[PDB]
C-alpha cells in the first residue's frame, strides 16, 4: 500500500512557469529518492529528473537540465517540480515514482496516476460541429467536432440513448494548434429517413454545448 | 381462450439478468417517434397468449 | 548515447502461446536490463529487474534472460490480462536512462477484410474555406493497411493524416480514418478524389473514388 498523488497540471503558454506537486503516503517519503518521468501524448517513457532522499542531490535529463528544478519537503512528505521556461515539448503527463534502492542502479517500483500539462500558444475556443450524412447493407453517419481547444470534448448520440455502434476516434492536434475529432455511428439503412439523429458535443473548458442534427444528403 | 396470461413482445434492449420490466410505453417499432399513441409503427409492447 | 531496439515492433498471438520479446543494446550492459508493462492509458508497471529477477507480486509466467546486449522476455503461457505494451529499459548508464521502442501484443484472430467508405467535404466546411475528405477503413485485421490518396490519378503524400483505433473488444478488428485536408482553391482545382486501400485480407487493392460536385 503506497500512494502517490499528482496535482498542479494544466494549460500554460510557452515560456511560462508551472509548479507540480506530488503527495506521497503509506511509506517513508524522506528515506527514498524520487523520480519524475514524463510521457508525451502517444509517445513512450522519458526519464526527466531524480531527487535524493535527503533532498541534497538533484539531477535532470539533458532535455530539461538548466530549465527545470526538483525539490522535496520531508516534513510535508511532498515533492515539488518547478518547470520554468516551458516549451511545447513539455506537453505530457508527468509521474512521480519511488526508487526502491534495492540495487546499485535506478529502477522503478511504483508509478502514480500522474498529471497532465499542456503547453500551447492558443486560447480556449468553442468547438465547431459539422454533420457527416450517409448515402445509399447498412449505413454510417457521424459528426465532426473541429477547431476546438483545449481537450477534452464529450460527444454523445441521441443524448446518450444511442450507445451500440458508436465509435469516437481520438482527437488529433492539427497544424493550427487546435484539436479535431470525429464521431461516427452505424445504423441500418432502413431507418434513415424519419429517424432524427442528433449529436451532442460538450466542451466544458470552453463551456460550449452544441446539438447538431444529422440527416441524409439530398441531391 | 384464457387471455389473462401476457408477455412482452417488444423492447428496445435485452433485459439484464434477473431484470423485471413492467413498463407499458408504446414501443417504437418504426423509427417515427410515437408520442404515447398507437397506430402506424406504434404497437403495444405486451401481447396476450391464446 | 545508448539506443535500445525492441523487437518485434508488434506481434499477434493467442492466449496460452509462449510469447518471446527481444531487446538489443547498442553497447554492452552487464545485467542492467529491465522490463516494464503498460496497458493502454494506464501507468507502467514493473515486471523484471536486473534482467533475471521477477518483481514481487508479478505472475511467475514472466521470465527474463540474457546478458550483454541481447535480452529476452518470455511468457510461457499468455493470458488475457497479458495483452499490453512491454518496454525494455537499460539501467547501465544511470544518468542517461533510456527505454525500448516497445512490442505491443495484440489478440490473434483471422484476417478481416476492411470496409472502405469515402466521405466528401461537407458544404458547411466548404463555406468556412477548408475541405476534408474522409476515408474510413472499418473492421479489418491486422492493422497493417496501406491507405493512399489519389487526385486526378496523382498520388498524394503528406496532405492527410491517419488515426487508428485500438484493437476492438468485440471482434478485435481495427478502424482507420484518413483525413485529406486542403483549401477550397485546391479542392476545385481537381475533380476526381479517390482512396485506395491495400490490406492482407484483400486479393487486390480496393479504390473508392468520387467526382467533385456530382453526388
Swiss-Prot record, chain B:
Changing residue 6 to R: Increased resistance to neutralizing antibodies. Decreases HLA binding to NF9 epitope. Increased binding affinity to human ACE2. Disulfide bonds join 34-42. Changing residue 31 to N: In strain: 20A.EU2, Iota/B.1.526, Omicron/BA.1, Omicron/BA.2, Omicron/BA.2.12.1, Omicron/BA.2.75, Omicron/BA.4, Omicron/BA.5, Omicron/BQ.1.1, Omicron/XBB.1.5, Omicron/EG.5.1. Residues 1-50 are annotated as: Receptor-binding motif. Residues 9-44 are annotated as: Disordered. Changing residue 44 to L: Increased resistance to neutralizing antibodies and human covalescent sera neutralization. Binds to host ACE2. RBD also interacts with the N-linked glycan on 'Asn-90' of ACE2. Cleavage of S generates a polybasic C-terminal sequence on S1 that binds to host Neuropilin-1 (NRP1) and Neuropilin-2 (NRP2) receptors. Interacts with host integrin alpha-5/beta-1 (ITGA5:ITGB1) and with ACE2 in complex with integrin alpha-5/beta-1 (ITGA5:ITGB1). May interact via cytoplasmic c-terminus with M protein. May interact (via N-terminus) with host bilirubin and biliverdin, thereby preventing antibody binding to the SARS-CoV-2 spike NTD via an allosteric mechanism. This is Spike protein S1. The chain holds residues 447 to 496 of 1273 of the full protein.
